[PDB]
Symmetry: C2
Subunit: 409 residues, 2 copies
């Protein structure tokens, strides 16, 4: 029909521009990738990264779905706000996957295996560029009217093959510990239980005369429980935003579900090592033991795992939630508290080690000695990046080999 | 106006969705920022980062200009492709600034000074959110018709105050090699001269019988000159895209200009240290003295500086240039060659050091000892990240204290 064609023709250029802005939104992340100015990125876990592969597939299917609805309504006649949201969410989630999976691959795997994964992430990123590019309007303009949906579904299935082959490249990485605890128990109840696990452990921790360092630890713990009580309310607001029971929701999203439980168990476990450390700072009043670095480690471990809990709690909400806002603000309370505790103990260390951490002047009159001195210096920043990328995987094996005994312990 | 009113019910909501997709394009980078998982990254110079501050200001002024033109053509009736490009370019360049300036601050500065810069990058990012937020058309439904341009220009000037105060936070970081003077000599002629500096130095090296390790270095140098000759065509593609003379172009963009010259001098200087290492041929046929790590440093230094030259060559374009494509592809030739030379020399080292780089099993049958062994591990990845963040600035002070002499010599 006429108006269906004429209003579509006016909005086809803008749809081309939005799509090309989509390609650019991805392409700016690929420029970023192949620039090694980007360096040592996220210690992102595979459990989360599978929920990105899944939510990518869902958003790609939502982009296909909303494109099919817009094909039936005439490719730019109908209201694009849904497609522009779905493009913008698929493009932002794909661009977040492409970012994250490079960071993850390069920081975790041996040479051939890292090289192998990146090659396929690139093919997936290019195939997503082909998803917008094999449409635009230029490539589509002559193709039969419904038949465009076969380009959509073939581009979908080939992308989904690359996502499945990418999935089959990440699935072999999963940890064995979940095998003995496949259960219907749900993360909501684990958070509700986590509150009591902490509170029953910390009932001990309200003596009649406090100490400076201890009080900061209580400010953390008290903020962490407030954060967990926010996290209890987060899912409950999702259960009212969604139109279906918690069981009918949880029974599909298994890869997100395991991410949220592993996050809840990381906050429980993290806080338990904080509480287990703070116990030394109350169960003796006398200075029988000290361990400042252990606090800096442990405070950074609560600070890192609490950020994973927000991120793992984020993926399923649009932002306007007061439970999200309260969780985020409470995470700033935890962040600032860990920063304060950090600054305090760093202060106690550097009170002495201002003697140790000194430097000497660097000027020279003879040019040969400058052109040499930088070529001395660039070799030290090699040995002390290899050492860090070498020892950071020995942890990833202590994460596995002993923990398969920890399943039975 | 009439057509402005008739389009409002459909076309304001989509413009709101595009703007909110703009806020989200930024907000995804701020969620990224305040997730420390998006960790220590780009070593990028202030010279480049000022061209981002400038091109942000120009794109912000182009978002102002194109929205002012749209305010005259009818607030959502007119062809939005220009505004949607300018929003998409301001949003991608701002999001790239917010990313890069966090990376730069945390990698370079002391505690107070890094804390200080990030605080203001956040205020600038929020003020940009307030800019699109103030254009979320609920605000423009109550402000007087032309008077919206005062919200635009006040939001602009306050952002520009934050960008100027941010600029004044980065300008104190600049260096003597251009702080002494700007000149009329231009980068085009420095590239043209760079070709001859390299070719006249490398006329020596080509001899009747080659060697394996040397041939790879000639593949680099030959690719690097091809890359520099591509870079000569890059500016002609800019200068023919523009209507104005090279002098009328160069006399404005001084911060970009110094970025491109310092990049060209980095590719000349990088290649000259590679050619100086191949000039270890000059003394002898026999191995008088050599070392491998010098090549790994130097090949990574050509590989890093050549990526800066492409990036510094991107900013003033659109992607469809054959000179851009040729430069990028040639940079892949250089990248792959450096990777090949890397792999070769790494191979020569590990042929021996397979003796050194060995590991032992990590399993345990006592939970206390596992829970301890991971807490032994987490402190080593502290000592060997402080050491790296400590020594990486003892280089950055050699960029000045001795280098002011070499900048004059």
């Amino acid at each position: 029909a006429a108006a269906e064609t004429m209003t579509q023709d006016k909005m086809n250029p803008i749809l081309d521009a939005i799509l090309e802005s989509g390609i650019n939104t991805i392409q700016e992340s690929v420029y970023n990738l192949d620039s090694p100015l980007s360096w040592s990125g996220p210690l992102t876990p595979p459990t989360f990264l599978l929920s990105l592969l899944e939510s990518t597939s869902e958003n790609a299917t939502e982009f296909a779905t909303s494109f099919n609805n817009l094909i039936v309504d005439g490719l730019a006649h109908g209201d694009q706000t849904e497609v522009i949201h779905c493009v913008s969410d698929f493009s932002t989630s794909m661009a977040t996957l492409v970012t994250n999976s490079k960071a993850y691959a390069v920081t975790t795997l041996p040479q051939e295996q890292s090289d192998q994964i990146l090659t396929l992430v690139k093919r997936c990123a290019r195939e997503a560029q082909y998803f917008f590019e094999d449409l635009m309007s230029e490539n589509l303009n002559q193709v039969g009217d419904e038949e465009k949906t076969d380009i959509v579904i073939n581009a979908n299935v080939d992308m989904q093959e690359k996502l499945q082959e990418l999935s089959l490249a990440i699935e072999p990485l999963l940890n064995i510990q979940s095998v003995k605890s496949n259960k219907e128990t749900n993360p909501h109840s684990e958070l509700v239980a986590t509150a009591d696990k902490i509170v029953k452990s910390s009932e001990h921790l309200r003596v009649d005369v406090p100490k400076p360092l201890l009080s900061l630890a209580l400010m953390i713990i008290d903020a962490v429980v407030a954060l967990v009580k926010a996290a209890i309310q987060c899912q409950n607001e999702i259960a009212t935003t969604t139109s279906i029971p918690l069981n009918q929701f949880y029974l599909k999203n298994s890869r997100w579900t395991e991410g949220l439980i592993s996050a809840a168990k990381a906050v429980a476990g993290a806080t338990n090592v904080l509480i287990t450390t703070a116990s030394k700072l109350i169960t003796s009043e006398d200075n029988e033991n000290t361990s400042p670095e252990q606090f800096i480690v442990a405070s950074k471990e609560v600070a890192a795992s609490t950020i994973q809990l927000v991120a793992a709690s984020r993926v399923k909400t649009s932002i306007h939630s007061k439970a999200q806002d309260k969780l985020e603000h409470c995470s700033k309370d935890v962040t600032d508290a860990c920063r304060s505790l950090g600054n305090h103990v760093m202060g106690m260390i550097e009170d002495d080690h201002s003697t140790s951490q000194q430097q000497q002047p660097l000027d020279f009159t003879s040019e040969h000695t400058l052109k040499t001195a930088e070529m001395e210096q660039q070799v030290e920043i090699l040995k002390l990046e290899q050492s860090l990328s070498n020892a950071r995987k020995r942890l990833g094996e202590i994460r596995r080999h002993a923990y398969y005994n920890q399943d039975d312990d």
